């Protein structure tokens, strides 16, 4: 009844080429996340008690 | 010999979708009947007693 959570990963992660004695850079990731519920769906029928 | 009564459903029944608080909708169905009766075919052939 709540709903769920969808995570999902999205970082731009990097590398890069270095000489000897170079140095060595630094990077970081990221991740996101969406939501989903549910919805209701419903009907009335009606009749005389005859 | 006095023939037949065929039924036959005819509902375009419904349904909706409705948030929490939003009031349902009301719907109905529908049928119809036919009728088929049989039918004669004859034929006389005559000759001579001779």
Same mark, same amino acid.
């Given at each position: 009844? *709540?709903? &769920? #959570? &969808? !995570?999902?990963? *999205?970082?731009? #992660?990097?590398?890069?080429? &270095?000489?000897?004695?170079?140095? @060595? !850079?630094?990077? @970081?990731?990221?991740? *996101?996340?969406?939501?989903?519920?549910?919805? @209701?769906?419903? *009907? &009335?029928? #009606?009749?005389?008690?005859?």
């Amino acid at each position: 009844a *709540t709903g &769920i #959570v &969808i !995570p999902h990963w *999205t970082g731009d #992660v990097s590398a890069q080429w &270095i000489g000897e004695g170079d140095m @060595k !850079p630094i990077t @970081k990731g990221n991740m *996101t996340k969406r939501d989903v519920h549910p919805a @209701k769906i419903a *009907t &009335i029928f #009606v009749a005389s008690a005859e």
